[PDB]
């Protein structure tokens, strides 16, 4: 049998939010000039110039 | 049937509530509750019930 | 005071009516009043001060309202309401305690504590709702200069006094005529003693009078009058008036003669009771005059005649008595009584925090000293603290 007391509930959620997928789109990524690019040892990748 | 600008989720709940409200065998207390039951939107907290 | 009482009453109603399984319609108006109280108190900072050993406490109010969401209240709703109610009840109890421990000579009826002074602002007047208790009702009526009274069972109207008056006395204290009396709370036990049993009296009649001036006017008083004073009917060794020596009392009880109890107001005979014992009614009075006669029995059996000789030494001393008990009364002023706990509550709060003696009340809230010198300023302060105590008793 249908019982109103047993069927009435309060559903709770958030009012609104925006879900994002591409996190890296929020990053402005630039690079140094290749002439000035350095390796792990802080020296230029290519030194013969 | 809300007397205080009430809202419910979802449209099926609205249909059920209207059917119970119009039913003659429904309790008066249940009818008054349907007429008075309210949602609670807390925008500051970003919550909706 | 009305806002503090309204906070206490709202919290009491919330604690009593917001219960698991109760219909939403049993609390709708209560929920509205409670949410109004929450809205009014939210965003306000209160401080209960550090008078005596009472700790300084800070109170912040940021509470969400109570919803109206279930047809029958559940455990979650009651838990949230209980959290809010517990915090509010602690705040109200501390405010009541802070107000109870202060006093003022000039404006004794006005709020004294900072918290209650703040609650007297206009912004908090919205919290005010039903004022049905006897003390809050009397407070509101008195603020409007309306006639109102407190009903007391066994009112504590007589300051403690166990003393005697000797109308005939000698250094040897062997032929004494006088009166003893205990005036304690609602009781007046008086006795008149003649050592000679009125042998030399003008008509073998000795007249005794006891006048008790009540510190406040009592109305609609029911009183019990009994012929004998049991407290002054056994042998005693009594210190002299100066305390230099002690005299001996050996009572023999005779029927009081021509008993007249007069209840007077403004010197007018309001009520008169002649030879009437049992339950009597005094309409409205401020003085009691008990006049009673010791009559030497004209006819005595040989033992009775042996008790009272025609001259000294007198071994048995003829005593007549009277017991008066104000069982209940109505007084326009607050008083201690046997059924209420206001004096006890205020005294306990003041003692448990070592409140220094103020400029109004006696040390330790001694009731005998308070009632003995029941000044208008003391009356105002006592009414204030008693109303606060009655407010506190609804929650604590
Ligand atoms: Cl009693
Ligand atoms: Zn009693
Ligand atoms: Zn003496």
Curated annotation (Swiss-Prot), chain C:
What is the annotated signal peptide range for this record?
Answer: none
Question: Residues that bind Zn(2+), according to the entry?
Answer: 153
Give the top-rank taxon of the lineage listed in the UniProt record for this protein.
Answer: Viruses
Pfam families under this entry? Rota_Capsid_VP6 (PF00980)
Task: List the InterPro entries.
Answer: Capsid_hemagglutn, Rotavirus_A/C_VP6, Virus_capsid_a-hlx_vir
Q: Does the keyword Zinc apply?
A: yes
In the record, what terms sit under GO molecular function?
Answer: host cell surface receptor binding; metal ion binding; structural molecule activity
GO biological process terms, alphabetically, are: fusion of virus membrane with host plasma membrane
| Post-translational modification note | The N-terminus is blocked. Sumoylated with SUMO1 and SUMO2. Sumoylation of viral proteins seems to have a positive role on viral replication.
Chain segments carrying region Interaction with the inner capsid protein VP2: 62-73
Q: Which residues bind Ca(2+)?
A: 266, 286
Where does it reside? Virion
List, alphabetically, the GO terms of the cellular component aspect.
Answer: T=13 icosahedral viral capsid; viral envelope; viral intermediate capsid
The main place the protein resides is virion
Keywords, A to Z, come to: Calcium, Capsid protein, Intermediate capsid protein, Metal-binding, Ubl conjugation, Virion, Zinc
The family note in this entry says:
Belongs to the rotavirus VP6 family.
Q: What does this protein do?
A: Intermediate capsid protein that self assembles to form an icosahedral capsid with a T=13 symmetry, which consists of 230 trimers of VP6, with channels at each of its five-fold vertices. This capsid constitutes the middle concentric layer of the viral mature particle. The innermost VP2 capsid and the intermediate VP6 capsid remain intact following cell entry to protect the dsRNA from degradation and to prevent unfavorable antiviral responses in the host cell during all the replication cycle of the virus.
What does the subunit comment say?
Homotrimer. Interacts with the inner capsid protein VP2. Interacts with the outer capsid glycoprotein VP7. Interacts with the outer capsid protein VP5*.
Q: Any extra detail in the entry? A: The VP6 trimer contains a zinc ion located at the center of the molecule. The zinc ion is not essential for either trimerization or transcription activity of the DLP. Zinc-depleted VP6 has an increased sensitivity to proteases.
Q: What is this protein called?
A: Intermediate capsid protein VP6
Q: Name its species.
A: Rotavirus A (strain RVA/Monkey/United States/RRV/1975/G3P5B[3]) (RV-A)
Tell me the organism's taxonomic lineage.
Viruses, Riboviria, Orthornavirae, Duplornaviricota, Resentoviricetes
